Design a protein around this ligand. Structure first.
Ligand SMILES: Cc1cc2nc3c(=O)[nH]c(=O)nc-3n(C[C@H](O)[C@H](O)[C@H](O)COP(=O)(O)OP(=O)(O)OC[C@H]3O[C@@H](n4cnc5c(N)ncnc54)[C@H](O)[C@@H]3O)c2cc1C
Ligand SMILES: Nc1ncnc2c1ncn2[C@@H]1O[C@H](COP(=O)(O)O)[C@@H](O)[C@H]1O
Lengths: 254, 318
């Protein structure tokens, strides 16, 4: 019994970041990398299944990305993931959610897991597309925005609750194997902030440059830019006077 | 050309984002001759023809599939068939929980353009140009769709303005393609949790986010809210952790604070999904030690200071 958890190492930007010369991306000098927040919850859900079962459950994390990603993978192993796999070649640079979905699917075909988990979305790009793209290439049952999972290893159905707008959930019975995208709050990840990573090339999974990268993506980046955004009226000075202004705002309100 | 819009309904009610999409479609199109086709999918979806017989709709297609409300297998097959029938240049879906279940699957199978959570769309000549966010909304990413005869976009809710007035679409009925879904919808659920206060009704809110740190810090903000005559609300990390009831959560998956005139956002970064719940509030104060927090881009007043230092001084002064 195996659960495959697709994970992304996301980039967050430092203050005073700049757009790079080509105008196509932010300058990498301003990026800080860490595991996608949704992936903490997905991984913990796989581990909960592993702990609840007398039967062995192999938890495999997989990421498509350059060598910086190994740090995040190493940390997943330390939290109890059984195996970690990084897929990359330089030709994969600029692969969108749908191409990433393709690449992940080539690993998954070989791993032949019983369930696939992915995050609802990435904190950086927030495509909310990658996991459901994987479901398409696998031609598997799927559900997005899963807030609860009732599933025993080997079962041919699961019961999930999707988290809807406006404070409601929906129970859905879904055939397994399935792809689920996992929402914040499904569980309380346990480790909240020398087995190696398995390194896989595009060749290892039957792909080449012509299958991946920006040329195969479903849209083309024209530019990336810092838009003019709304500006608050900033209250400077001491805490006493900042609080004094708040109270005046409250009083003006009533 | 045709622009295809996929409407959305749940629990017998049309979701208003449906009309924002029609507004977007009508704005987007290149000539008066182009047509907007709206589809509504459901086993009981004829019920929605009145609410979708509105300004800007040229054709209205009722698709009867196997499920009452959203099913990803039914929707994907149905929307694929609509695209075949209407050969739309652009297909507009809402960037909603339902759409997240299928939109990227629909685009994986086919040679369609695709982008999600789009908040600017226009034609430059014959070229469709869409803008979405990058790096947790710190940049705009402007994209196009070279050589794509059909582009599928999911559209950010509450950005595009609906049209006013009735309309007189040509109404048709089609059956969805006949394939068995791999899932079955069961109960809707409103989970447990206190509900002493309907936060859609209240006019003064102090809201706390992850910046409060540990649960032991909630009490002092509850006391502040009480001393101020505000209702204590939160962002999702706080409710997910069980520190306040889900009935107090503000945003897309929580509630919209429709009656709120003053919202004090403390230790909340201003994620899109939080903003969905409170961006309309006529006076927002943000108190946050990160000047680059998204919340400052909608706040009237910003204070870049420690929330505990501000809370204690506010309490003293009050
Ligand atoms: C489908 C979906 C639906 C969602 N629905 C909702 C929803 O309904 N509501 C919602 O809230 N979220 C929703 N989200 C979650 C959302 O993406 C974010 O995870 C969330 O809003 C972040 O909450 P936060 O701002 O409290 O936390 P963070 O983004 O971590 O922000 C914490 C803030 O605290 C500040 N801070 C830290 N220490 C201090 C200090 N001492 N003094 C002052 N400031 C401090 C930081 O600078 C930071 O800006 C949804 C997400 C998805 C994908
Ligand atoms: N490069 C990647 N490698 C592995 N999984 C990924 C990658 N990119 C996205 N994902 C998965 O998709 C989710 C993020 O969603 P999205 O916003 O569509 O990228 C993550 O939590 C992962 O489960």
């Amino acid at each position: 019994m195996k659960i495959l958890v697709a994970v992304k190492q996301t980039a967050a930007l430092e203050e005073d970041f700049e757009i790079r010369e080509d105008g196509m991306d932010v300058d990498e000098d301003f990026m800080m990398y860490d595991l996608n927040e949704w992936d903490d919850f997905s991984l913990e859900e796989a581990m909960k299944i592993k702990e609840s079962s007398d039967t062995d459950v192999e938890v495999v994390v997989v990421s498509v990305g350059p060598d910086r990603v190994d740090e995040s993978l190493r940390k997943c192993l330390a939290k109890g993931a059984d195996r970690a796999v990084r897929v990359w070649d330089d030709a994969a640079e600029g692969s969108d959610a749908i191409v990433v979905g393709r690449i992940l699917t080539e690993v998954i075909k070989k791993e032949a897991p019983d369930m696939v988990f992915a995050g609802v979305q990435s904190s950086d790009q927030a495509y909310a597309s990658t996991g459901i793209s994987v479901a398409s290439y696998l031609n598997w049952p799927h559900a997005a925005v899963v807030a609860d999972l009732q599933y025993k290893p080997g079962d041919n159905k699961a019961v999930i609750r999707r988290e809807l707008e406006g404070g409601m959930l929906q129970e859905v019975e879904i055939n397994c194997p399935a792809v689920l995208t996992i929402q914040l709050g499904i569980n309380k990840p346990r480790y909240a902030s020398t087995k190696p990573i398995e390194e896989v090339s595009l060749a290892d999974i039957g792909l080449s440059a012509n299958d991946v990268g920006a040329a195969q993506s479903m849209s083309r980046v024209r530019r990336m830019y810092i838009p003019e955004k709304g500006r608050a009226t900033m209250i400077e000075g001491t805490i006493s006077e900042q609080a004094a202004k708040i109270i005046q705002i409250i009083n003006e309100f009533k | 050309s045709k622009i295809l819009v996929i409407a959305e309904h749940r629990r017998n009610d049309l979701r208003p984002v449906s009309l924002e999409l029609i507004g977007a479609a009508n704005g987007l199109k290149k000539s008066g001759e182009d047509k907007v086709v709206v589809a509504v999918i459901g086993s009981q979806a004829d019920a929605f023809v009145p609410a979708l017989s509105v300004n800007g709709v040229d054709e209205l297609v009722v698709v009867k599939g196997s499920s009452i409300d959203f099913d990803p297998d039914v929707f994907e097959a149905s929307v694929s068939a609509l695209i075949a029938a209407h050969n739309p240049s652009v297909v507009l879906l809402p960037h909603s929980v339902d759409s997240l279940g299928y939109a990227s699957s629909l685009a994986s199978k086919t040679g369609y353009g695709f982008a999600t959570d789009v908040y600017i769309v226009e034609y430059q000549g014959d070229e469709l140009v869409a803008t979405r966010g990058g790096y947790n909304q710190k940049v705009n990413v402007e994209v196009d769709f070279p050589g794509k005869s059909t582009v599928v976009l999911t559209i950010r809710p509450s950005v595009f303005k609906p049209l006013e007035g009735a309309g007189s679409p040509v109404v048709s009925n089609v059956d969805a393609p006949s394939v068995q879904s791999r899932s079955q919808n069961k109960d809707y659920v409103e989970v447990g949790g206190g509900n002493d206060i309907d936060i859609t009704t209240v006019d003064f809110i102090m809201s706390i986010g992850r910046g409060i740190g540990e649960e032991t810090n909630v009490e002092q903000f509850r006391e502040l809210a009480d001393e101020a005559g505000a209702t204590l609300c939160c962002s999702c990390p706080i409710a997910d952790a069980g520190w306040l009831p889900k009935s107090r959560q503000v945003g897309q998956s929580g509630k919209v604070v429709g009656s709120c005139k003053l919202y004090v956002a403390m230790g909340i970064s201003g994620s899109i999904q939080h903003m969905a719940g409170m961006k309309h509030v006529p006076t927002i104060i943000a108190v946050n030690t990160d000047p680059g927090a998204s919340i400052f881009t909608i706040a009237k007043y910003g204070i870049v200071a420690d929330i505990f230092d501000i809370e204690e001084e506010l309490k003293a002064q009050l």
